[PDB]
Structure 1
Amino acid sequence: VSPLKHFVLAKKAITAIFDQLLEFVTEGSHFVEATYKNPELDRIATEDDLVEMQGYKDKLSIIGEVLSRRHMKVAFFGRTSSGKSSVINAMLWDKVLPSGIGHITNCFLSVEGTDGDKAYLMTEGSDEKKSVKVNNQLAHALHMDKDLKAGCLVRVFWPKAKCALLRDDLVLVDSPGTDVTTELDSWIDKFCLDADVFVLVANSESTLMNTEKHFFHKVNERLSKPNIFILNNRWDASASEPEYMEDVRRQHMERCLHFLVEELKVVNALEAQNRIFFVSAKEVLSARKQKAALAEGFHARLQEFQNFEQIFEECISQSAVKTKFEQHTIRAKQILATVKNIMDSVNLAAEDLPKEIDQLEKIQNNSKLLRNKAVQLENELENFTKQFLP
């Protein structure tokens, strides 16, 4: 006994550590602020120190929330028409989300499991379990009037009996295309930035753009190094021009590897192997939506979608301790290290009237005692990593 209990122990442990962390950094932020702003002190603490510590307080509050959340959030991200909606529709075995040519998905869509045997949707502040067939009115931009305003979230519920993956506490998120408008991008941040796992749906007819990559650098800048699956979707395109298939596949694989391993430095090359796939959502959906001449390599592309689903499931369940917590604990260690440096910098600055020197040594004592609280927390995080991680 048991996978579930191992997770709940881990959650209580790390959440409790992060409580201590957040109060520590808030206190240190107030100390540094006070020292910087005091007109009596010859530049003891710097503005940069203050901004960094304030940034860390914010960072840690948001990460705190992410840790304590009841659910594992998976955000789907990509350019317009790479295949985000269609990938989810394939995982669900039915065309249940708005999909098509042009800009379509014009709202954010939660997808969760339900114990009931029928699907439904719910809208901002409504108990009403509306028909899943109403989606287009709310989420499909060829239906929606161009006036409709700044939000939104529509929560789709799909029966757990159909679709294994939705059990339990998993939440999939279909979003709009990146880089369509500034406002849409700011909403894509608000909704998707704090996701536990990202599925980058790339267009395998094309290659990876920098605006697509920039998002994941932003995730790291604001929170922690992102857990990323790359689906090179539309791979059925390579059935035309088989004389280059392997060369094109090699190009994508090399570029995606470079993105995860060299640019983000989130994963090593061997790990990245099991995060990059070549698939056709369209084919998988078409085949699945049928069990009451085929295009070449269909079966290979199907088997890789299945591998993606297997590995995706292995992470949000078996390795949910790792998936939910690891990257945030690493970032916690990093932030603490920098906080220690700031406290040291303030201490040494303090070394260079009787009331004025007495005030200055009080800053020294404060900075040292904060420093050792930081080392205590570093040890508690190191213990957590030992007892709960590889």
Structure 2
Amino acid sequence: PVSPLKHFVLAKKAITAIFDQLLEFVTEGSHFVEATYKNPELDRIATEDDLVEMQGYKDKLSIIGEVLSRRHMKVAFFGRTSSGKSSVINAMLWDKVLPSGITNCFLSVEGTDGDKAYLMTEGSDEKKSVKTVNQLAAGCLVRVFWPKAKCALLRDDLVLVDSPGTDVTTELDSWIDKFCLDADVFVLVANSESTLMNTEKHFFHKVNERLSKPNIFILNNRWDASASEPEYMEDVRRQHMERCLHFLVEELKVVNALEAQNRIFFVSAKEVLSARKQKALAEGFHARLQEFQNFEQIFEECISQSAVKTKFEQHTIRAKQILATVKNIMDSVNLAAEDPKEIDQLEKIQNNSKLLRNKAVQLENELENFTKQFLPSS
């Protein structure tokens, strides 16, 4: 009953809280080495180089929690002009969010605290509404915003991108790519009374070399066209399996033949659409429908865990590094300290350093906790 995207907003609130108090930590630790380096009555208890890398660390830890709030999972859709890339998004999002059919641009779909329908373009803040300016308009991205409370997906900061047809424009395939570099999961919406083309395989081959380990789903859409005929169907689908096991396992070599069954699906969004807008019968629809609704799950299961690694792995790593360095500086300071009655001057830069020791110890352990938490494994 719970949407595997919970993983993601949970890991989110974790790291941000982490880097919130990480900033606070390095903030406080920065002034210690500052006031104490400046102290005219001290020889060399805290070098200026100690201050400089502390000035450095929080300078940029401010940045991290910032981009750690701008945060998002992204799945991108590709296929012939209308294999129903139109409709699949439209299906997962329980509404007609965006037209079936068309012209050439990327169409991303986010999740707003605002309550009404939305749309913004490249290169500034103007805001014109939804299907208002859809017919309107070296790549081109215009990004559709629908409201928070319409979809569990857009709540749990998933966003969906529709591409123009891989059918109708080459220009090479790489403003193609600097739109997709964000993405965690790439979906191939195939069109099933037809056959898996080469002008669609062109793309993922690049992406395979573009980006390492890309996680790729094949949605053989419009599975109604072959219905009413029980294993006229299964005949069609296994050779369809043949083209897709073909692709994922052996040319792309995405990932082996077993787990490739969890990547190839035979559904039609148009059915899943209607049954999801009916919330105020062709033979084997509830089969097709639940076929969609375990594509749902393993997608969410996949694009969930995946995205947390690919964009926290080394914010997390760098943090322990940053933490690692400040221990040594807190060492350095407590150390030159002990080397009058400004006896208890450094017996007042004694323990502050020990506090700042344990200040770090504080945050080591939590980062370790975050890693068994969301980064399997250890």
TM-score (norm 1): 0.61
Q: Structure 1 residues 26 and 285, CA, compared in 2 at 3 Å: closer, same or farther? A: same
1:126 aligned partner: 124
Please say if residues 105 and 140 of structure 2, whose CA atoms lie closer than 8 Å, have aligned partners that are also in contact: yes
Q: Structure 1 residues 125 and 39, CA, compared in 2 at 3 Å: closer, same or farther? A: same
Q: Structure 1 residues 241 and 99, CA, compared in 2 at 3 Å: closer, same or farther? A: same
Offset from partner CA, 1:171-197 (integer Å, 9 cap, x none): 211110014122384433332355211
- Secondary structure of the structure 2 residue equivalent to 1:230: strand
Q: Structure 1 residues 182 and 370, CA, compared in 2 at 3 Å: closer, same or farther? A: farther
Offset from partner CA, 1:49-103 (integer Å, 9 cap, x none): 99999999999999999999732221101122211111111112222212138xx
Shift of 1:311: 1.9
Please say if residues 5 and 300 of structure 2, whose CA atoms lie closer than 8 Å, have aligned partners that are also in contact: no
Shift of 1:289: 1.6
Q: Distance in 2 between matches of 1:45 and 1:181?
A: 61
Please say if residues 267 and 292 of structure 2, whose CA atoms lie closer than 8 Å, have aligned partners that are also in contact: yes
Q: Structure 1 residues 131 and 59, CA, compared in 2 at 3 Å: closer, same or farther? A: same
Greater fraction of residues in helix: 1
Q: Distance in 2 between matches of 1:68 and 1:88?
A: 25
1:32 aligned partner: 33
Q: How does 1:33-72 map to 2 (within 5 A)?
A: 70-72=71-73
Shift of 1:152: 2.0
Please say if residues 350 and 360 of structure 1, whose CA atoms lie closer than 8 Å, have aligned partners that are also in contact: yes
Q: Structure 1 residues 66 and 81, CA, compared in 2 at 3 Å: closer, same or farther? A: farther
Please say if residues 305 and 374 of structure 2, whose CA atoms lie closer than 8 Å, have aligned partners that are also in contact: no
Q: Distance in 2 between matches of 1:100 and 1:257?
A: 29
2:148 aligned partner: 160
Q: Structure 1 residues 72 and 300, CA, compared in 2 at 3 Å: closer, same or farther? A: same
C-alpha RMSD over aligned residues: 9.9
Q: Return 7-16 or 122-131, whichever deviates more.
A: 7-16
Q: Structure 1 residues 209 and 378, CA, compared in 2 at 3 Å: closer, same or farther? A: farther
Shift of 1:136: 2.5
Q: Distance in 2 between matches of 1:232 and 1:38?
A: 71
- Secondary structure of the structure 2 residue equivalent to 1:24: helix
- Secondary structure of the structure 2 residue equivalent to 1:134: coil
Q: Distance in 2 between matches of 1:108 and 1:7?
A: 25
Shift of 1:322: 4.8
Q: Distance in 2 between matches of 1:214 and 1:39?
A: 68
Q: Structure 1 residues 334 and 284, CA, compared in 2 at 3 Å: closer, same or farther? A: farther
Q: Structure 1 residues 118 and 350, CA, compared in 2 at 3 Å: closer, same or farther? A: closer
Q: Distance in 1 between matches of 2:223 and 2:342?
A: 71
Q: Return 261-270 or 228-237, whichever deviates more.
A: 261-270
Please say if residues 196 and 324 of structure 1, whose CA atoms lie closer than 8 Å, have aligned partners that are also in contact: no
Shift of 1:366: 42
Q: Structure 1 residues 196 and 185, CA, compared in 2 at 3 Å: closer, same or farther? A: same
State the number of aligned residues.
Answer: 375
Please say if residues 225 and 327 of structure 1, whose CA atoms lie closer than 8 Å, have aligned partners that are also in contact: no
Q: Distance in 1 between matches of 2:153 and 2:375?
A: 24
Q: Structure 1 residues 263 and 2, CA, compared in 2 at 3 Å: closer, same or farther? A: closer
Q: Return 174-183 or 128-137, whichever deviates more.
A: 128-137
Q: Distance in 2 between matches of 1:228 and 1:181?
A: 22
Offset from partner CA, 1:199-254 (integer Å, 9 cap, x none): 11011211211221221110122221311111110111111544411111111122
Please say if residues 90 and 288 of structure 1, whose CA atoms lie closer than 8 Å, have aligned partners that are also in contact: yes
Q: How does 1:318-337 map to 2 (within 5 A)?
A: 318=305, 320-322=307-309
Please say if residues 202 and 230 of structure 1, whose CA atoms lie closer than 8 Å, have aligned partners that are also in contact: yes
Please say if residues 4 and 300 of structure 2, whose CA atoms lie closer than 8 Å, have aligned partners that are also in contact: no
Please say if residues 18 and 64 of structure 1, whose CA atoms lie closer than 8 Å, have aligned partners that are also in contact: yes
Structure showing greater Rg: 2
Please say if residues 110 and 157 of structure 2, whose CA atoms lie closer than 8 Å, have aligned partners that are also in contact: yes
Q: Distance in 1 between matches of 2:197 and 2:315?
A: 27
Please say if residues 8 and 305 of structure 2, whose CA atoms lie closer than 8 Å, have aligned partners that are also in contact: no
Shift of 1:22: 24
Q: Structure 1 residues 63 and 135, CA, compared in 2 at 3 Å: closer, same or farther? A: farther
Q: Structure 1 residues 65 and 271, CA, compared in 2 at 3 Å: closer, same or farther? A: farther
Please say if residues 119 and 131 of structure 1, whose CA atoms lie closer than 8 Å, have aligned partners that are also in contact: yes
Q: Return 220-229 or 43-52, whichever deviates more.
A: 43-52
Please say if residues 4 and 301 of structure 2, whose CA atoms lie closer than 8 Å, have aligned partners that are also in contact: no
Task: Pick from 172, 175, 189 the counterpart of residue 201 of structure 1.
Answer: 189
Task: Pick from 353, 356, 369 the counterpart of residue 355 of structure 2.
Answer: 369
TM-score (norm 2): 0.63
Please say if residues 90 and 97 of structure 2, whose CA atoms lie closer than 8 Å, have aligned partners that are also in contact: yes
Gaps of 5+ in 2: none
Gaps of 5+ in 1: 138-147
Q: Distance in 2 between matches of 1:221 and 1:364?
A: 54
- Secondary structure of the structure 1 residue equivalent to 2:178: helix
1:92 aligned partner: 93
Q: Return 177-186 or 339-348, whichever deviates more.
A: 339-348
- Secondary structure of the structure 1 residue equivalent to 2:173: helix
Q: Distance in 2 between matches of 1:67 and 1:26?
A: 18
Please say if residues 75 and 198 of structure 1, whose CA atoms lie closer than 8 Å, have aligned partners that are also in contact: yes
Q: Distance in 2 between matches of 1:65 and 1:265?
A: 37
Q: Structure 1 residues 3 and 276, CA, compared in 2 at 3 Å: closer, same or farther? A: closer
Shift of 1:362: 49
Shift of 1:157: 1.1
Offset from partner CA, 1:82-139 (integer Å, 9 cap, x none): 11111111112222212138xxx421111000112222111123323321121432xx
- Secondary structure of the structure 1 residue equivalent to 2:80: coil
Q: Structure 1 residues 3 and 214, CA, compared in 2 at 3 Å: closer, same or farther? A: closer
Please say if residues 227 and 283 of structure 2, whose CA atoms lie closer than 8 Å, have aligned partners that are also in contact: yes
